[PDB]
mmCIF file of C-alpha atoms in Angstrom:
data_model
loop_
_atom_site.group_PDB
_atom_site.id
_atom_site.type_symbol
_atom_site.label_atom_id
_atom_site.label_comp_id
_atom_site.label_asym_id
_atom_site.label_seq_id
_atom_site.Cartn_x
_atom_site.Cartn_y
_atom_site.Cartn_z
ATOM 1 C CA UNK A 1 0.000 0.000 0.000
ATOM 2 C CA UNK A 2 0.768 3.628 -0.868
ATOM 3 C CA UNK A 3 2.618 6.127 1.351
ATOM 4 C CA UNK A 4 0.290 7.913 3.804
ATOM 5 C CA UNK A 5 1.073 11.283 5.389
ATOM 6 C CA UNK A 6 -0.459 12.884 8.479
ATOM 7 C CA UNK A 7 0.188 16.589 9.090
ATOM 8 C CA UNK A 8 -0.831 19.318 11.533
ATOM 9 C CA UNK A 9 -2.927 22.034 9.834
ATOM 10 C CA UNK A 10 -0.177 24.442 10.961
ATOM 11 C CA UNK A 11 1.850 23.093 7.942
ATOM 12 C CA UNK A 12 -1.039 22.871 5.348
ATOM 13 C CA UNK A 13 0.670 25.356 2.987
ATOM 14 C CA UNK A 14 4.280 24.075 3.290
ATOM 15 C CA UNK A 15 5.991 21.872 0.688
ATOM 16 C CA UNK A 16 7.218 18.548 2.051
ATOM 17 C CA UNK A 17 10.815 19.514 0.990
ATOM 18 C CA UNK A 18 10.660 22.905 2.826
ATOM 19 C CA UNK A 19 9.165 21.263 5.922
ATOM 20 C CA UNK A 20 11.870 18.475 6.041
ATOM 21 C CA UNK A 21 14.770 20.925 5.420
ATOM 22 C CA UNK A 22 13.441 23.281 8.175
ATOM 23 C CA UNK A 23 12.654 20.498 10.685
ATOM 24 C CA UNK A 24 16.106 18.907 10.110
ATOM 25 C CA UNK A 25 17.834 22.311 10.657
ATOM 26 C CA UNK A 26 15.767 22.732 13.909
ATOM 27 C CA UNK A 27 16.683 19.200 15.118
ATOM 28 C CA UNK A 28 20.271 19.818 14.008
ATOM 29 C CA UNK A 29 23.103 17.294 14.314
ATOM 30 C CA UNK A 30 23.515 15.211 17.463
ATOM 31 C CA UNK A 31 27.171 14.417 16.500
ATOM 32 C CA UNK A 32 26.697 10.602 16.800
ATOM 33 C CA UNK A 33 29.837 9.637 14.844
ATOM 34 C CA UNK A 34 33.392 8.340 15.357
ATOM 35 C CA UNK A 35 35.721 10.762 17.088
ATOM 36 C CA UNK A 36 32.866 12.630 18.820
ATOM 37 C CA UNK A 37 31.429 12.191 22.309
ATOM 38 C CA UNK A 38 28.687 9.559 22.266
ATOM 39 C CA UNK A 39 26.742 9.162 25.537
ATOM 40 C CA UNK A 40 23.141 8.921 26.726
ATOM 41 C CA UNK A 41 22.494 12.473 25.327
ATOM 42 C CA UNK A 42 22.917 11.356 21.696
ATOM 43 C CA UNK A 43 22.420 7.551 21.367
ATOM 44 C CA UNK A 44 18.633 7.589 21.215
ATOM 45 C CA UNK A 45 16.786 4.404 22.254
ATOM 46 C CA UNK A 46 14.857 1.378 21.032
ATOM 47 C CA UNK A 47 11.492 0.043 22.094
ATOM 48 C CA UNK A 48 11.843 -2.558 23.457
ATOM 49 C CA UNK A 49 15.661 -2.501 23.011
ATOM 50 C CA UNK A 50 18.406 -2.724 23.821
ATOM 51 C CA UNK A 51 19.543 -2.965 20.182
ATOM 52 C CA UNK A 52 16.294 -3.830 18.342
ATOM 53 C CA UNK A 53 12.718 -2.648 18.304
ATOM 54 C CA UNK A 54 9.497 -1.624 16.668
ATOM 55 C CA UNK A 55 10.662 1.981 17.366
ATOM 56 C CA UNK A 56 13.950 3.904 17.413
ATOM 57 C CA UNK A 57 13.619 7.408 18.894
ATOM 58 C CA UNK A 58 16.011 10.294 19.377
ATOM 59 C CA UNK A 59 15.706 13.805 20.847
ATOM 60 C CA UNK A 60 17.747 16.746 19.508
ATOM 61 C CA UNK A 61 20.604 18.135 21.598
ATOM 62 C CA UNK A 62 19.926 21.607 20.026
ATOM 63 C CA UNK A 63 16.125 22.012 20.540
ATOM 64 C CA UNK A 64 12.948 20.170 21.781
ATOM 65 C CA UNK A 65 12.758 18.430 18.306
ATOM 66 C CA UNK A 66 12.567 14.608 18.224
ATOM 67 C CA UNK A 67 11.757 11.832 15.793
ATOM 68 C CA UNK A 68 10.455 8.281 15.996
ATOM 69 C CA UNK A 69 11.321 5.644 13.382
ATOM 70 C CA UNK A 70 8.791 2.802 13.326
ATOM 71 C CA UNK A 71 8.986 -0.702 11.847
ATOM 72 C CA UNK A 72 11.177 -3.726 12.691
ATOM 73 C CA UNK A 73 14.598 -2.132 13.289
ATOM 74 C CA UNK A 74 17.981 -3.561 14.339
ATOM 75 C CA UNK A 75 21.355 -2.075 15.289
ATOM 76 C CA UNK A 76 24.563 -4.080 14.805
ATOM 77 C CA UNK A 77 26.718 -2.097 17.306
ATOM 78 C CA UNK A 78 30.234 -3.630 16.829
ATOM 79 C CA UNK A 79 29.036 -6.679 14.793
ATOM 80 C CA UNK A 80 29.892 -6.927 11.063
ATOM 81 C CA UNK A 81 28.826 -4.677 9.424
ATOM 82 C CA UNK A 82 29.598 -2.306 12.332
ATOM 83 C CA UNK A 83 27.152 0.457 13.452
ATOM 84 C CA UNK A 84 24.396 -0.451 10.924
ATOM 85 C CA UNK A 85 20.714 0.375 11.501
ATOM 86 C CA UNK A 86 18.753 -2.034 9.280
ATOM 87 C CA UNK A 87 15.419 -3.857 8.901
ATOM 88 C CA UNK A 88 11.952 -2.568 7.973
ATOM 89 C CA UNK A 89 11.232 1.189 8.182
ATOM 90 C CA UNK A 90 7.441 1.634 7.975
ATOM 91 C CA UNK A 91 7.155 5.177 9.415
ATOM 92 C CA UNK A 92 8.912 8.406 10.463
ATOM 93 C CA UNK A 93 7.184 10.764 12.946
ATOM 94 C CA UNK A 94 8.604 14.293 13.400
ATOM 95 C CA UNK A 95 7.803 16.876 16.024
ATOM 96 C CA UNK A 96 8.693 18.132 19.459
ATOM 97 C CA UNK A 97 8.779 16.683 22.992
ATOM 98 C CA UNK A 98 9.602 12.967 23.041
ATOM 99 C CA UNK A 99 7.785 10.998 25.755
ATOM 100 C CA UNK A 100 7.707 7.374 26.792
ATOM 101 C CA UNK A 101 10.050 4.578 25.903
ATOM 102 C CA UNK A 102 10.297 0.839 26.383
ATOM 103 C CA UNK A 103 9.035 0.934 30.004
ATOM 104 C CA UNK A 104 5.867 2.839 28.829
ATOM 105 C CA UNK A 105 5.272 0.352 25.947
ATOM 106 C CA UNK A 106 6.250 2.945 23.377
ATOM 107 C CA UNK A 107 7.615 6.358 22.436
ATOM 108 C CA UNK A 108 5.345 9.245 21.473
ATOM 109 C CA UNK A 109 5.690 12.907 20.587
ATOM 110 C CA UNK A 110 3.709 15.415 22.721
ATOM 111 C CA UNK A 111 3.702 17.691 19.628
ATOM 112 C CA UNK A 112 3.690 15.467 16.534
ATOM 113 C CA UNK A 113 3.799 17.697 13.446
ATOM 114 C CA UNK A 114 4.143 15.291 10.484
ATOM 115 C CA UNK A 115 4.245 11.504 9.986
ATOM 116 C CA UNK A 116 5.126 9.507 6.882
ATOM 117 C CA UNK A 117 3.688 5.988 6.984
ATOM 118 C CA UNK A 118 3.555 2.920 4.671
ATOM 119 C CA UNK A 119 7.141 3.728 3.608
ATOM 120 C CA UNK A 120 7.730 0.051 2.749
ATOM 121 C CA UNK A 121 11.499 0.405 3.193
ATOM 122 C CA UNK A 122 13.384 -2.838 3.951
ATOM 123 C CA UNK A 123 17.194 -2.844 4.099
ATOM 124 C CA UNK A 124 19.055 -6.108 4.685
ATOM 125 C CA UNK A 125 21.965 -6.319 7.137
ATOM 126 C CA UNK A 126 24.352 -7.127 4.232
ATOM 127 C CA UNK A 127 24.113 -3.587 2.801
ATOM 128 C CA UNK A 128 25.610 -2.151 6.022
ATOM 129 C CA UNK A 129 25.637 1.671 6.250
ATOM 130 C CA UNK A 130 24.882 1.814 2.492
ATOM 131 C CA UNK A 131 21.344 0.548 3.236
ATOM 132 C CA UNK A 132 18.548 3.007 2.558
ATOM 133 C CA UNK A 133 17.071 2.585 6.113
ATOM 134 C CA UNK A 134 20.458 3.444 7.668
ATOM 135 C CA UNK A 135 20.999 6.493 5.347
ATOM 136 C CA UNK A 136 17.447 7.819 6.043
ATOM 137 C CA UNK A 137 17.760 7.594 9.825
ATOM 138 C CA UNK A 138 21.440 8.617 10.102
ATOM 139 C CA UNK A 139 20.577 11.646 7.925
ATOM 140 C CA UNK A 140 17.964 12.757 10.456
ATOM 141 C CA UNK A 141 20.439 12.167 13.343
ATOM 142 C CA UNK A 142 23.039 14.277 11.477
ATOM 143 C CA UNK A 143 21.120 17.389 10.326
ATOM 144 C CA UNK A 144 20.541 16.196 6.749
ATOM 145 C CA UNK A 145 17.052 15.134 5.540
ATOM 146 C CA UNK A 146 18.246 14.531 1.906
ATOM 147 C CA UNK A 147 17.949 10.718 2.040
ATOM 148 C CA UNK A 148 14.438 10.870 3.610
ATOM 149 C CA UNK A 149 13.419 13.512 1.008
ATOM 150 C CA UNK A 150 14.639 11.231 -1.834
ATOM 151 C CA UNK A 151 12.601 8.245 -0.550
ATOM 152 C CA UNK A 152 9.418 10.272 0.007
ATOM 153 C CA UNK A 153 9.872 11.805 -3.479
ATOM 154 C CA UNK A 154 10.117 8.285 -5.042
ATOM 155 C CA UNK A 155 7.123 6.956 -3.057
ATOM 156 C CA UNK A 156 4.929 9.944 -4.049
ATOM 157 C CA UNK A 157 5.943 9.651 -7.760
ATOM 158 C CA UNK A 158 5.113 5.893 -7.652
ATOM 159 C CA UNK A 159 1.493 6.802 -6.589
ATOM 160 C CA UNK A 160 1.412 9.482 -9.343
ATOM 161 C CA UNK A 161 4.248 11.282 -11.242
ATOM 162 C CA UNK A 162 2.575 14.682 -10.575
ATOM 163 C CA UNK A 163 3.105 14.350 -6.786
ATOM 164 C CA UNK A 164 6.506 15.143 -5.324
ATOM 165 C CA UNK A 165 8.308 16.611 -2.348
ATOM 166 C CA UNK A 166 7.602 20.016 -3.955
ATOM 167 C CA UNK A 167 3.832 19.400 -3.389
ATOM 168 C CA UNK A 168 2.272 21.119 -0.361
ATOM 169 C CA UNK A 169 0.655 18.993 2.355
ATOM 170 C CA UNK A 170 -2.765 20.410 1.379
ATOM 171 C CA UNK A 171 -2.113 19.369 -2.316
ATOM 172 C CA UNK A 172 -1.176 15.856 -1.104
ATOM 173 C CA UNK A 173 -4.426 15.751 0.983
ATOM 174 C CA UNK A 174 -6.427 16.747 -2.132
ATOM 175 C CA UNK A 175 -4.536 13.940 -4.067
ATOM 176 C CA UNK A 176 -5.691 11.391 -1.367
ATOM 177 C CA UNK A 177 -2.233 10.526 0.144
ATOM 178 C CA UNK A 178 -2.297 12.915 3.151
ATOM 179 C CA UNK A 179 -4.673 13.741 6.032
ATOM 180 C CA UNK A 180 -4.698 16.960 8.148
ATOM 181 C CA UNK A 181 -4.910 16.894 11.996
ATOM 182 C CA UNK A 182 -6.263 19.883 13.976
ATOM 183 C CA UNK A 183 -3.607 22.224 15.479
#
């Protein structure tokens, strides 16, 4: 089934590309890479975890921004191929104010702005950090929504070549692939 998008009416008139570039700049870069400090402020977490879950969530170290990746996700840690996030990525939820976690039975956003669902992304462990799931999520961790934008653009064009990340949310709701939520 086709990509589905939920959006707050606050963002009705934004293009998907402008929204993702702006949100990613607001979230910023948590600096989760070799040669940087990595600690409980920038690892994120899995539900249920420790290294696998139906959700991976991370809060910004620069703002109240957070995201939740949903599907059937796995992290290799030191195991070949090292530091790979792989598996099935069904959804990305973007907003502010991460709540919950494994002990609550799930993460949530107190202010969810936009979700992309039915992404249908499935990256095998063998692709390592070249897997699309890894690139999408690591991009969001790192201040760069370009991989997510490219996958949304392809999913929209697959529904109809007239739809793209340059469509507004309201245009995508008219097209039948998005749904507004009251702000």
